Design an enzyme around this catalytic site. Sequence first.
Site, mmCIF file in Angstrom:
data_model
loop_
_atom_site.group_PDB
_atom_site.id
_atom_site.type_symbol
_atom_site.label_atom_id
_atom_site.label_comp_id
_atom_site.label_asym_id
_atom_site.label_seq_id
_atom_site.Cartn_x
_atom_site.Cartn_y
_atom_site.Cartn_z
ATOM 1 C CD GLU A 158 -2.689 -1.479 2.280
ATOM 2 O OE1 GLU A 158 -2.713 -0.640 3.195
ATOM 3 O OE2 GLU A 158 -3.329 -2.548 2.384
ATOM 4 N NE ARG A 213 -2.575 -8.907 2.482
ATOM 5 C CZ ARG A 213 -3.328 -8.803 3.573
ATOM 6 N NH1 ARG A 213 -4.116 -7.806 3.937
ATOM 7 N NH2 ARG A 213 -3.014 -9.584 4.530
ATOM 8 C CG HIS A 283 -4.470 0.502 6.180
ATOM 9 N ND1 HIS A 283 -4.100 -0.804 6.156
ATOM 10 C CD2 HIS A 283 -4.341 0.950 7.419
ATOM 11 C CE1 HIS A 283 -3.786 -1.177 7.457
ATOM 12 N NE2 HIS A 283 -3.914 -0.053 8.249
ATOM 13 C CB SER A 284 -3.638 2.373 0.126
ATOM 14 O OG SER A 284 -3.455 2.026 -1.206
ATOM 15 C CD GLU A 357 -8.596 0.992 3.949
ATOM 16 O OE1 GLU A 357 -7.781 0.754 3.004
ATOM 17 O OE2 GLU A 357 -8.603 0.313 5.027
HETATM 18 ZN ZN LIG Z 1 -4.082 -2.089 4.452
#
Ligand SMILES: [Zn+2]
Length: 395
Positions: A158, A213, A283-284, A357
């Site tokens: 991310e 991740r 986050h993303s 996000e």
């Molecule tokens: Zn995340």
Amino acid sequence: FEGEKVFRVNVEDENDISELHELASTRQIDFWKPDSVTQIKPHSTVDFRVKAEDILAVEDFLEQNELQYEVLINNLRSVLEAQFDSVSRTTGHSYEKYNNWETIEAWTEQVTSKNPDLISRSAIGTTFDGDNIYLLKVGKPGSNKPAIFMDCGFHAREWISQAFCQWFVRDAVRTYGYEAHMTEFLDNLDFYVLPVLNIDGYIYTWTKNRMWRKTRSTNAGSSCTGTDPNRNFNAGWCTVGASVNPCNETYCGSAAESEKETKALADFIRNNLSSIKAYLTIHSYSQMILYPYSYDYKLPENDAELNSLAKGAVKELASLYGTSYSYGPGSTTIYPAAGGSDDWAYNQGIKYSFTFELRDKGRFGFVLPESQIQATCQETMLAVKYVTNYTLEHL
Ligand SMILES: [Zn+2]
């Protein structure tokens, strides 16, 4: 990633979901949003990426089973190549380009040297591979100041997240003694900025697999590597929406705080608990602001406040570029998932706990090009200052 595609599929009902359990058990699908098949709910959309070799098998399955789909990204390879499109000539750190860790790690040092009066730097522990976890404490140093904790880069792939914590620190220094509110914030508060929680993963996304991740820790009994750091907290630890199988992306770890990384952060926060008034975790992708609970359908006592604060912040954000965000409590906005840091910080007593996000909403997904770094960070900064200003007046 030549010839790989990202699909958007819609799922109408629970049979559609169980059809996608069968797909997943037969092909290796990388779920982008949500982050597993087990977190899909009816009447929603699912983004995932498919290996070149699997493209035809999956487009038959969807077709033969009536799943209505759209191809988000026709060639991931291209998107991967468009990525590094900064019009910056610099080999070192830039705020408008994606930095590798060697470059981030040296930046944290340089920015501390250059603005010793405003910035201080620690190592709150060491990662699995023994990398140092740096924390920057940003503020005019003062007796008994309240704090705001902000971290980036819990999930390795991310990258815009990592890019944000850097931008923030640049603005905090640039507009000190020039912007009225920013100067008052740094006088009144400290900001703790953890620019990269998952360093080991971050380096893995640079060196080997862009799409990784989890952490890079080793698992007993398996040759599968990593826990999901946002499942490894002691908030309903692993009771819903999380696996015990280490080869899953939602591997919750062998115990709550089993990662060195997440133990460091949790300990640091607990040692400072009476200062830290708000918790922000970046986050993303998908453009949302989440607040507790994710582990449960229970609402925080606070709910109405967090809800209005989120609504205001998302209204600020849009000012710049017209970017639409949505918001709500994580469980109904997405689907229940246990062990996240936002829920845990909240249950520690930190009334203001958010996840952001960032962009985009699936055109590029995680693979956002460097050219969108700055616009992205400018608008977020507007929601971040809003909430800081809110918290300051409710200490
Ligand atoms: Zn995340």
